[PDB]
PDB file of N, CA and C in Angstrom:
ATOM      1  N   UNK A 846       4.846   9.128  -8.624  1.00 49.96           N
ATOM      2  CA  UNK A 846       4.677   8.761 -10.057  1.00 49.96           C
ATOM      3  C   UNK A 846       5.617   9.526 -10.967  1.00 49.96           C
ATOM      4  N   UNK A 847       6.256   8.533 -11.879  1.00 50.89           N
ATOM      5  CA  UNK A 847       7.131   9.972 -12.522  1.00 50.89           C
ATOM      6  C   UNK A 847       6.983   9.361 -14.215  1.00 50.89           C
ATOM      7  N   UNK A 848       6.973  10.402 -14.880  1.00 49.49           N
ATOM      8  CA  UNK A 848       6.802  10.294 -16.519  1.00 49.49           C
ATOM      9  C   UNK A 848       7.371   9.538 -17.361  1.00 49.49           C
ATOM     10  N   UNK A 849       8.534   8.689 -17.039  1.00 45.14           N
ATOM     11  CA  UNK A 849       8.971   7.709 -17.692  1.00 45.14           C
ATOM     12  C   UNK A 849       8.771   6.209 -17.057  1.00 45.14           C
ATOM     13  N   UNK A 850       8.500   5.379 -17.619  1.00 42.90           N
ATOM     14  CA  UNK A 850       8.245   4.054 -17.467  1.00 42.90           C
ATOM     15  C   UNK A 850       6.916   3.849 -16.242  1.00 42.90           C
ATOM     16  N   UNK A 851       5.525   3.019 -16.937  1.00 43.34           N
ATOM     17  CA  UNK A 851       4.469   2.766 -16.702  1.00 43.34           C
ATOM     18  C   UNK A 851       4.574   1.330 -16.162  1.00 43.34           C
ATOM     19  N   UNK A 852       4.205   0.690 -14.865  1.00 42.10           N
ATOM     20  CA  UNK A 852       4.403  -0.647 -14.514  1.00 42.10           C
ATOM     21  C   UNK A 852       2.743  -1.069 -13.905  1.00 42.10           C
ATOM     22  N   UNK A 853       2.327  -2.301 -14.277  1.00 41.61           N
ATOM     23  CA  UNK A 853       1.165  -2.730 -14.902  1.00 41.61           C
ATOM     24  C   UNK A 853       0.195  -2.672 -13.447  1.00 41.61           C
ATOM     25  N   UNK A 854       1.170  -3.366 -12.619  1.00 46.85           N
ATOM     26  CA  UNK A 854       0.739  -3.475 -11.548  1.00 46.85           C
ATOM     27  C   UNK A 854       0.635  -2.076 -10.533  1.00 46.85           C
ATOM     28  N   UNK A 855       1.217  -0.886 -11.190  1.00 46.01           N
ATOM     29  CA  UNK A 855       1.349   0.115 -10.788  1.00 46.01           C
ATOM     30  C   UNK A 855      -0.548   0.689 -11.301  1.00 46.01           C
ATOM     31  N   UNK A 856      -1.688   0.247 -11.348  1.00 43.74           N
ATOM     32  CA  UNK A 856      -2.751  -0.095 -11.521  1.00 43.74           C
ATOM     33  C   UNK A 856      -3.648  -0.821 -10.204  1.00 43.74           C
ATOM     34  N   UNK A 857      -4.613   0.321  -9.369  1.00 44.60           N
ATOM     35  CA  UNK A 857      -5.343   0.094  -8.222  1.00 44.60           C
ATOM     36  C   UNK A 857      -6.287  -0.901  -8.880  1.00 44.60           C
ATOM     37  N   UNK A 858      -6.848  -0.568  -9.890  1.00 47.09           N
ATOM     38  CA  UNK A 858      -8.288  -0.558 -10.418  1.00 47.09           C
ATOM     39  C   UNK A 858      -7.340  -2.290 -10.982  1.00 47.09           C
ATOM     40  N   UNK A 859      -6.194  -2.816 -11.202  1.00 43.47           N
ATOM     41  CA  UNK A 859      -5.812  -4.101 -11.846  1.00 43.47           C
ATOM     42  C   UNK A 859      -5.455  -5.139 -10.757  1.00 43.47           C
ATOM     43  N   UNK A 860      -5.771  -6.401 -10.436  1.00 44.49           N
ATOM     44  CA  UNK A 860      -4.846  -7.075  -8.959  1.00 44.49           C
ATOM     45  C   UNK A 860      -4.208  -7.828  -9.872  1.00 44.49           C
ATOM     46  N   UNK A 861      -3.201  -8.682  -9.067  1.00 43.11           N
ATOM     47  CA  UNK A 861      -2.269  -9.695  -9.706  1.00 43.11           C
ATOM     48  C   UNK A 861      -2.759 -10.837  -9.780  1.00 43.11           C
ATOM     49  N   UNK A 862      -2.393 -11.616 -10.755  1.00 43.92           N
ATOM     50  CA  UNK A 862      -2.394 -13.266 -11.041  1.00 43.92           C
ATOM     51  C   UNK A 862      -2.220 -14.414  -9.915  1.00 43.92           C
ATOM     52  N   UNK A 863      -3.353 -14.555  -8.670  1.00 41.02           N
ATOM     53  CA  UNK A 863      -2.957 -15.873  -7.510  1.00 41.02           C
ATOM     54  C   UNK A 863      -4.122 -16.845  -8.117  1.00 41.02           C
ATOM     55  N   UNK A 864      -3.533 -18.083  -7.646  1.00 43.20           N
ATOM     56  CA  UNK A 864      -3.899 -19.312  -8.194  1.00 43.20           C
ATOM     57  C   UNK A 864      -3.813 -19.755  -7.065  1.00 43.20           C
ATOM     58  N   UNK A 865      -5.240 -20.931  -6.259  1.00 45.06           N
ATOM     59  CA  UNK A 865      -5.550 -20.756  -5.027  1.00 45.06           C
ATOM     60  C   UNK A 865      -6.245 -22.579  -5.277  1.00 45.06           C
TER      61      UNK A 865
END
Protein backbone atom coordinates (compact mmCIF):
# COMPACT_ATOMS: atom_id res chain seq x y z
CA UNK A 1 0.00 0.00 0.00
CA UNK A 2 1.64 3.25 -0.56
CA UNK A 3 0.33 6.96 0.31
CA UNK A 4 -0.36 8.32 -2.91
CA UNK A 5 -3.24 7.32 -5.07
CA UNK A 6 -6.36 5.25 -3.49
CA UNK A 7 -8.00 2.64 -6.13
CA UNK A 8 -11.67 1.70 -5.36
CA UNK A 9 -11.36 -1.70 -5.96
CA UNK A 10 -8.28 -1.67 -3.87
CA UNK A 11 -11.37 -2.26 -1.13
CA UNK A 12 -11.88 -6.12 0.44
CA UNK A 13 -14.99 -5.06 2.22
CA UNK A 14 -16.21 -3.51 -1.88
CA UNK A 15 -16.64 -6.39 -4.98
CA UNK A 16 -16.96 -5.31 -8.56
CA UNK A 17 -19.89 -4.65 -10.91
CA UNK A 18 -20.87 -8.54 -12.77
CA UNK A 19 -24.04 -8.72 -14.53
CA UNK A 20 -25.08 -12.42 -14.76
Amino acid sequence: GFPRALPAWARPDYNPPLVE
